[PDB]
Amino acid sequence: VVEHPEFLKAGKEPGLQIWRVEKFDLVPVPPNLYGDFFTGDAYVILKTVQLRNGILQYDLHYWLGNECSQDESGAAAIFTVQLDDYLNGRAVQHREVQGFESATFLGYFKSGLKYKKGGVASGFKHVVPNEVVVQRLLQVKGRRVVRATEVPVSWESFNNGDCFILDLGNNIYQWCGSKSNRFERLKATQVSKGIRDNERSGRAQVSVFEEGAEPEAMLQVLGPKPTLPEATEDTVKEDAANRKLAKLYKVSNGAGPMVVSLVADENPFAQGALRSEDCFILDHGKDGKIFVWKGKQANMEERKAALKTASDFISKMDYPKQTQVSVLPEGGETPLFRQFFKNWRD
């Protein structure tokens, strides 16, 4: 079931062996330090004895320092049973806790144990389940073609006739200008419900209101509302811009060599453009976003290539340094990526 490199070494001749757990790995302690145990780590110890008949006798002891992390002491435990399994189960197992070791275990060391402060750091990356930490604002503008772009979180980006999603993670606050329009309204709603159901997996709450119904939390973030500019101008020139907001590229080694090709200059991209055989890049980088889309059947070369190509776009086109590339599996597309397609169907 397991013949790890160090297992191969384990228990061949009568002796004492000691590995320490290190970032989910078993690593031999140098024999010259046998007896030292960092209190922040966990070790596995195998003691092999020449039984008088011919076969060998095996005692696995896993020692857990008082200050060792859970990954370390779990690993020590898991390794112990795998060690034991590699020996066809013929070893008894022994949990040893710092300062309460068995007389047997202390007996393995002629000169006494010596505990040492410190240890190799845990292999765990820390997470808190379901936690989102998001604060951002989306300008939503348009008429025949409405798109949602990112802007600085302030009143300095507001205007009487665009909509706005103040996305604060758990709560999304949607805002609509007095002098706004109907199509901006509908699309702002699609995006907000999208951020909630899709991006947030249902664990947020949207709230829709207009200029003058400003909720409690809208103000806590932005301070008090000042006076209001009436936008740059008109919807027709806002549509001609939304239409040229992004470019969609294909990445395919389908005939041999890799080929990054421009698929589309203009908007509503056809969903059919995205094919499972290849990868795609939707570059919207002047906002601060490049999407790599990965066809379920794209090979690893194409996936690697699309990701490199896209990160290349950042250092090339003088995009914000803090622009980052967001990678999507086919099937797991986000609202801000989806907005660029005509009537998206799942």
Binding site: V1, V2, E3, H4, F7, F24, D25, L26, A42, Y62, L64, Q70, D71, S73, G74, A75, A76, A77, I78, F79, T80, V81, Q82, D84, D85, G89, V92, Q93, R95, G123, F124, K125, H126, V127, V128, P129, N130, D197, N198, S201, G202, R203, K294, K296, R303, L328, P329, E330, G331, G332, T334, D346
Partner: protein, 349 residues
């Protein structure tokens, strides 16, 4: 690359990436259809007014395979948002899960998500590993089931397992019944489940605490809803979880969890019970009630031989211990060796 750990329970689904502390995503194992032609988890719950909800997992066992695809899809492509084809995937199963069950699991992961590899781990053994033990007896209690799983040197002794179809949803239902009987009228199960998890507690001596509840109001605690409502609750605080010890409260002739633990240790070889008794690892959301370990202590020391050393271990994060076990296991250098790869699947802890 990077391994996914997905621990799918009857009520909740804990999902994330091997290597992490904890699950990234925790969400309801529910699949909603109309009366978009499917909905999962938290989104399905919100839209339940136009959907019919089903739970693919029943008492720890998957029973609706189509709906379960929906859950896994929802997991990969939305909760974690990753190509499953790029990521080996650890899944957990219940103690005495049928071989035919885990075979479907496995076929689905390869034949419909095209994962490069996978492994299926029993949940209780993972919880034990998370506690940094190879030998103990686990009491997993979740939303839908409760098991006693004696484990010796990393392997469950299947003949000594005990399943018990009484867990959290049942406690929540009970809390609803008696809050209603009390005078509240409990869209409102979720409120009640919240109360259960913030106000309920296990009492050390039940009748002794009933008497304390009659004599003053020192035991009364309230729960404040945002609509202004305050629901104040006294002896039903500790009566609700008291059901784990006394299944007869909800009409069940089954025995309580302190007896099932005892009976489990007694199905084991006499030469390993000393170890079993000193290593009661508690796993699972329904074991989270304040005071539960002291009761288990009290109750099983009164069942066990007069001189036995008894310990109950109650990990502070025992709510996610199966998952944490999977993350550690899926991360070990030795684990590459013992996955089942897609290639191995096309040739057929």
């Amino acid at each position: 690359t990077t391994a996914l750990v997905c621990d799918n329970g009857s009520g909740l689904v804990k999902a994330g990436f091997a290597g992490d502390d904890a699950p990234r995503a925790v969400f309801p194992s529910i699949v909603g259809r109309p009366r978009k032609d499917s909905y999962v988890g938290d989104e399905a719950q919100s839209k339940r007014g136009i959907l019919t909800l089903k739970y693919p997992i029943e008492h720890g066992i998957i029973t609706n395979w189509d709906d379960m695809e929906k859950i896994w899809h929802h997991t990969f492509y939305n909760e974690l948002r990753v190509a499953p084809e790029e990521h080996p995937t650890l899944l957990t199963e219940a103690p005495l899960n049928p071989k035919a069950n885990r075979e479907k699991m496995t076929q689905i992961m390869f034949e419909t998500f095209n994962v490069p590899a996978m492994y299926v781990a029993i949940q209780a053994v993972l919880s034990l590993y998370a506690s940094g033990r190879t030998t103990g007896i686990v009491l997993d209690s979740g939303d839908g089931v409760t098991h006693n799983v004696p484990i010796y040197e990393g392997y469950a002794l299947p003949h000594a397992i005990m399943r018990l179809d009484l867990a959290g949803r049942d406690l929540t239902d009970y809390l609803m019944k008696i809050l209603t009987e009390r005078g509240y009228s409990f869209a409102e199960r979720e409120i009640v489940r919240d109360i259960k998890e913030k106000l309920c507690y296990v009492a050390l001596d039940f009748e002794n605490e009933m008497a304390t509840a009659a004599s003053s109001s020192s035991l009364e605690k309230s729960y404040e809803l945002p609509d202004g409502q305050v629901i104040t609750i006294g002896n039903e605080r500790f009566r609700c979880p008291e059901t784990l010890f006394q299944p007869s409260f909800i009409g069940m002739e089954s025995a309580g969890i302190h007896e099932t633990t005892y009976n489990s240790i007694m199905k084991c070889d006499i030469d390993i019970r000393k170890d079993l008794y000193a290593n009661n690892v508690m796993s699972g959301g329904t074991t989270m009630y304040p005071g539960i370990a002291d009761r288990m202590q009290k109750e099983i020391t009164a069942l066990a031989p007069s001189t036995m050393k008894i310990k109950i271990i109650a990990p502070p994060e025992r709510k996610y211990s199966v998952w944490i076990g999977g993350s550690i296991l899926a991360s070990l250098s030795t684990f590459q060796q013992m996955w089942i790869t897609k290639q191995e699947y096309d040739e057929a802890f």
